[PDB]
Design a protein around this ligand. Structure first.
Ligand SMILES: Nc1ncnc2c1ncn2[C@@H]1O[C@H](COP(=O)(O)OP(=O)(O)O)[C@@H](O)[C@H]1O
Ligand SMILES: Nc1ncnc2c1ncn2[C@@H]1O[C@H](COP(=O)(O)OP(=O)(O)O)[C@@H](O)[C@H]1O
Ligand SMILES: Nc1ncnc2c1ncn2[C@@H]1O[C@H](COP(=O)(O)OP(=O)(O)O)[C@@H](O)[C@H]1O
Ligand SMILES: Nc1ncnc2c1ncn2[C@@H]1O[C@H](COP(=O)(O)OP(=O)(O)O)[C@@H](O)[C@H]1O
Ligand SMILES: Nc1ncnc2c1ncn2[C@@H]1O[C@H](COP(=O)(O)OP(=O)(O)O)[C@@H](O)[C@H]1O
Ligand SMILES: [Mg+2]
Ligand SMILES: [Mg+2]
Ligand SMILES: [Mg+2]
Ligand SMILES: [Mg+2]
Ligand SMILES: [Mg+2]
Lengths: 370, 370, 370, 370, 370
């Protein structure tokens, strides 16, 4: 059976082809102890991976090997893959095909080192690497539309018409949920709460995923909270209680005005879609407006699909009725689409075999995997 | 049953003998994709013909095999004929007679290659090729008059008296509707609209067929629009709106003064008829002035028959009253006349049989088909 | 004395008639601060123009008022002209004649608004507007030849024979150096360097003007760099070093195959000249092939004149020997030719006086300036 | 005359505008007796403020109202301000303007309560609050550079270019001289000396300011002292003598490696400057490296400017020559700059008047004081 | 077999590894006669050690070599060790390994002189020194929790999580049972009983260990005894009877408010635990609250565990349920844990051999014994 591994900046999702959902989802982190061992009977390790690092984070310093979709530490990246094959799936990687994913317009060296490790360290028989936004269209059962994908490190838009690519309209911003966590941690200091460690950053991420929401009218929302000053209580791991005010809707507002974090010229979600559509062709634009697909975990805020539709309607001409499609399970769209694609009988010739890599070299991955 | 196929520069019209109208009319284009396939489940082809190419033109580059009445790509010309027999009429071409049309004073190689393909590739039993302007007289039920035919690539005039040809008075200009589309696309840039692709050229052709008209007095019309500056709105496929000013009546004015597009010595519609009549005989001219017949799609502009009659009256002597006949269905005159001619019992000996071609060779078509 | 101002998409060149070179050349940009003032003693402005904006670009957002030869912001366009008259030339514009330039086939509204501002805001006595490619022929001292002009926004070709214009052979593409900067910035991401701001775009423009060159044989050049992988180092303003590989010759290759940036049907430099010549007359073509003149800053790449000559020779018939003339100072050909033309004694009747504008109105500029 | 009051965690500095130095500097402490009065003729108080508390500290328990730049006891904070106006300056606070200082990224409630006390309790006519690091640039007579300020509770870095703020590059650590005193008191127990009371903590602070110095090479310095074991004698208030060994250079080493006190992820002085510079813009970094300004009492250790310059040079690229500016009087830079700023004639409109506070409320301080 | 010797300020506990309890427990005192010998046949010594000194204390002056965990007389310290090896265990110290204990944050010279005596005077083969609070966790069979140890001279708290040390949260007060004996001896004078000699101080220590208890509500307990005035009788060695009133619960109240003996700023038992927990990490505090371990002889008062739990619950947040673990045999926890640790097979490499001391010197003990 073939293995589908959706590895992004934040999470790892692994499973087998043909299933409807991944069976193993864990954070993509590596932890190391920062103090000396005091007892003698402990079964402590020297490096912690995955959920082990998350649970013992009180005594560890945490690192993410991938930043903005690019691997910055290959030694720690092999530890995560070694964890996935032997501890999560519990298989022998020499007997399965592996399908991987990547963001568009990445440096070529990132794709070449990934292939070298898979063939030489793990001895995989055959390999394939896909583009994340294309795999999201497979899960929706359509061949026309524009996909907005926002995860932990990158946001990109890819338009497709009748199954044909439009390479000159692809956009990428490099600003996603991890930058939202840092902004929330900073504006939280206005109320007297300060977090600085990597372990405390994981607490801030939980506050974002439970209390933050998109305001339908931002300017009115600020005025109302200035007078009412309604607040909500959050319970910290140590038992204390933290109050959250207007930080709840100011944090996701970055996705609509990136100048709050210094990106004074980055477009933002409505303009990113609008500019990408107007670069395709005049005879294609009406169909693209009718199928706008949301994907990724950073699109899971409450009221985000409704706010996005209203903003685009103010940019498009009067006769255009934009339609935004937001599946309830869009956090796993990339993995689901990859499971569908690898099950097709016509795909069996698209695998990159080990024998071809032995002759052509690492550069063969660029010729194939289109 | 016999097949009538009126194939010009722009359109294909096909049907069966005895009918009052063709049953299949589609543009004569071939489309090819200009980008790479991105999905795997699509039923995409590699070449598109006819209305398929028109609908998917946003991702295709379009070509016309015929230019100025002469085939410039025989491989793409066979694709169009193959489309007509098997997808439109859905017949076996080995059991029907085929009647084709051609413009006068064409190169001899054009007619010879057409015969070779029909007999050897499609194995047609018998064949015939006619002159387009002569077939227009059949549909009017007359044997005397001069025909002005203007389609997409060629304009020609042919006079006939009592059923006798007058070979030394035939004229041909090679300037028709496709040159009108290019002129409209150029003078449209004076108002800030630029179209450059082949797909965008199809949009300009729709603007010509809906908003352009012939001005009865050109010089007065320009003066009035200089002050009023009245404009009309046209809605583009993507939802935007384009304003059209005096380009509405300047575009068809080319047919009356070809020096606007650089043909400083070509006559134009009134002079083309006038010069053709004065080359026939003094005892024939009065009858020719009384029956001037319009044919083709480029004669469908509003006010064109009225403007033409006035201009000729300024050239003819005072005792002559020219009369212009413009049937409301003159876009299909050539096809209708060919349907009538092929139904006559005296025509059954005029077919060129396959056996004769086997002996004489391709040159037999010149001896017959007179 | 008369003033010559060559204002294109990228640069402003100003001076006085009779001189051999302009005395003031600065970029055509306007800058505005994007953060709040923190100190109190600074002499900061609110808008920066010219070289002031270039030097302080670290804290400013930059805009070009002119895009593709058409003014898109008239308020910022007046600031640039106000800067030129009072800060660069330091004259009173009510005592001098002004000669301006424009690209062919521009919208009529662009020329009318330019005249209204000059007469009403600056109170210029007399005015004239010329065509850039014609002024380049004056600087070469010839009356026959075809001019290829490529600046920052537009590329056009204009043929002239014995001093007579050939209006139906003029071509224009709207693709020039600014599109080359954007393509270099995109293919630079394949090596792990990302620039997104307007200020960072000025750094990419300096890399193009120092390291990029035209490859004589493109296909062989790619193969050699695939094995040798020779690279060159460029020093960034902050002290870091960037390596440039085969991006050096891939960037100017767009001028020879515009399908790399999506213009799948635009001709390119050799085909643009070839198509323009074959539209003139059969008795003029041999003289045009003998005088092909290069003008503009986008023609300054190394090996460009040699590559252009070879490509044209493969399109022309065997008995034709094309000759390309590339002056070493062709970046200032338009300004130099305008200085010559305004010094002629026969030109003194060609000025458009203010009194005529008072009666006829802004439309007088179309009747004159031919 | 206007009053300038620089109130930090450790000291109070007060004076009048226009002077070159403050006239009153005293510690910011409040003392209360811990035993019962035994005699009857004493003029003892119940609360001691300032130098009175310092002298009688043998029978008092001492508290600091401000911790890490944030007021933790407002009742004791009013006693310190009441002491400053009536006992030190000896003025009526209803006739002078007051200028105050604050650290960046402080909680908003801290600034609001400060304004309420000044207007309602002391009836000040007009008020203003500034940022400490900005006022340090005024005293140096420059508008470009990055300021490192380290006092008793907070360390922060603020970059400024051409008088423009760069809000997204400000950093703050909350670790300063008071944490250095606690670390020295702990490692002093390795030699058999134990101090536990608040009064004994003032003795340890005097040892830090007289015997501690920065080692140019820390690892070599430890090795040399392991063999030589050279020591220095310090005389205690009671007449006994304490010997100090390698604690002299280990105490200020915390500023270069904060993991010695448990802040395993805080950067430290060289990394704090390096990270702040690399967040500004590529076109600004070279000027920032050339002007690095030291401010505050915790930068007064011997050899600190020389060690800082060497460490930064190992982080910057090879073509960069960092320059550190350390004025001999940098302990009073914030007060001096505030005296200069309040003397400017353009500043007279920046005062926040009492009438405005009556209408807008305490929130007016956020709109102004930028 | 290995020897375990738990030597604190008050008692000596010695035994062999593997046993469940020490076999020899005697006070750590040295006695000398204060009068002249009168008879001739007596077998009197000149120095008495251990239980010999306790029995003949009527004619001796007693001294403790160790005060606050630090040896103040090394000559008398060797007499106690010589007594333990030859009179109590009756072994040859050249054939056994010795494990010793020490309080945290002791002067380094104390540990170095101890090693020098063991290796050079007694010629021990191998040696090891541990931290007392860590050894108490071994006896409980846990790797997480915070230990409160209070003996005769020192009180300290040490938190441990998952076997990892937290060095920056260790606290030490230097106030234990010997200070409780002196306070009881002073407040006993309010009822007319005066003890001044060292021998009489041993009688007061017996009164503390039999009649003193912790009051659950101190303020109510004082009020009840003011009216009832209930008293208890104690029989002195000479036959007289002493009455004890409210001194029974006032003596152990010092452990909860150290200001009764002049330590006005020392925290006390509930605050010592509370401050130590809040210095560890937010993700560790909940587990520490659930395992609070009592150790040492000064925790043996009646009702002490119940009073401690109630006081901590008033300091912790509402969702926290503190749990105090008080083993019935906690007076020997340090010795028992050391017996367990020295029996582990993984510990056999942790011994400090004599050969290593010969080369490295006395400083080797700091590198090991972590
Ligand atoms: N319900 C939610 N609301 C807002 N953000 C979320 C939610 N769930 C997950 N996220 C954010 O999505 C990011 C990761 O998204 P995902 O696409 O699943 O991972 P990856 O970036 O690895 O592809 C994380 O930064 C996380 O904070
Ligand atoms: N209503 C109309 N008004 C003006 N032009 C028309 C109209 N309808 C068709 N045309 C033009 O007629 C041309 C084709 O005419 P037709 O004779 O039918 O085809 P063909 O040239 O193949 O014989 C096209 O260029 C089209 O733009
Ligand atoms: N040496 C060079 N090599 C390549 N390109 C150049 C060179 N010098 C200038 N350019 C380009 O020429 C463009 C401007 O050319 P120019 O004709 O002088 O200005 P304008 O477009 O305003 O007329 C700019 O985009 C610049 O990048
Ligand atoms: N010569 C010195 N060497 C080292 N530290 C010093 C020296 N002088 C003062 N300090 C320290 O500076 C701190 C206060 O600095 P300062 O900035 O003047 O006060 P504040 O923190 O109130 O602004 C005190 O902790 C003091 O110990
Ligand atoms: N039952 C008891 N109640 C109160 N205090 C006790 C009790 N038993 C012993 N102590 C006190 O404990 C102290 C010694 O405790 P321990 O920890 O055994 O010795 P060390 O201090 O040498 O480690 C002595 O001061 C003694 O008075
Ligand atoms: Mg993802
Ligand atoms: Mg026709
Ligand atoms: Mg130019
Ligand atoms: Mg300060
Ligand atoms: Mg003990």
């Amino acid at each position: 059976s073939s293995i589908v591994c959706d590895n992004g900046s934040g999470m790892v999702k692994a499973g087998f082809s043909g299933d409807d959902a991944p069976r193993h989802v864990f954070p993509s982190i590596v932890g190391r102890p920062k103090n000396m061992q005091a007892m003698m009977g402990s079964a402590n390790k020297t490096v912690y991976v995955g959920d082990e690092a998350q649970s013992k984070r009180g005594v560890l310093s945490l690192k993410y090997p991938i930043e903005h979709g690019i691997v910055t530490n290959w030694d720690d990246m092999e530890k995560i893959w070694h964890h996935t094959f032997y501890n999560e799936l519990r298989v022998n990687p020499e007997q399965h095909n592996v399908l991987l994913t990547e963001a568009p317009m990445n440096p070529k060296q990132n794709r070449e080192k990934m292939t070298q490790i898979m063939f030489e360290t793990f001895n995989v028989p055959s390999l394939y690497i896909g583009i994340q936004a294309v795999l999201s269209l497979y899960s929706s059962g359509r061949t026309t539309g524009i996909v907005l994908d926002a995860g932990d490190g990158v946001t990109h838009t890819v338009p497709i018409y009748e199954g044909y690519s439009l390479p000159h309209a692809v956009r990428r911003v490099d600003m996603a949920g991890r930058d939202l966590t840092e902004y929330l941690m900073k504006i939280m200091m206005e109320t007297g709460t300060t977090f600085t460690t990597t372990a405390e950053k994981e607490i801030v991420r939980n506050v974002k995923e439970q209390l933050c929401y998109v305001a339908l009218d931002f300017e009115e929302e600020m005025t109302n909270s200035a007078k009412s000053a309604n607040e909500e209580a959050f319970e910290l791991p140590d038992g204390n209680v933290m109050m959250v005010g207007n930080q709840r809707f100011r944090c996701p507002e970055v996705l609509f005005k990136p100048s709050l974090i210094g990106l004074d010229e980055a477009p933002g979600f409505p303009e990113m879609v609008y500019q990408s559509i107007n670069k395709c062709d005049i005879d294609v634009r009406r169909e693209l407006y009718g199928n706008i697909v949301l994907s990724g975990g950073s699109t899971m805020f409450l009221n985000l699909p409704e706010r996005l539709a209203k903003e685009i309607s103010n940019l498009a001409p009067s006769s255009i009725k934009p339609k935004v499609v937001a599946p309830p399970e869009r956090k796993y769209s990339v993995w689901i689409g990859g499971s569908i694609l690898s099950s097709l009988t016509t795909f069996q010739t698209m695998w990159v075999k080990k024998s071809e890599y032995d002759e052509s070299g690492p550069s063969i991955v660029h010729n194939k995997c289109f």
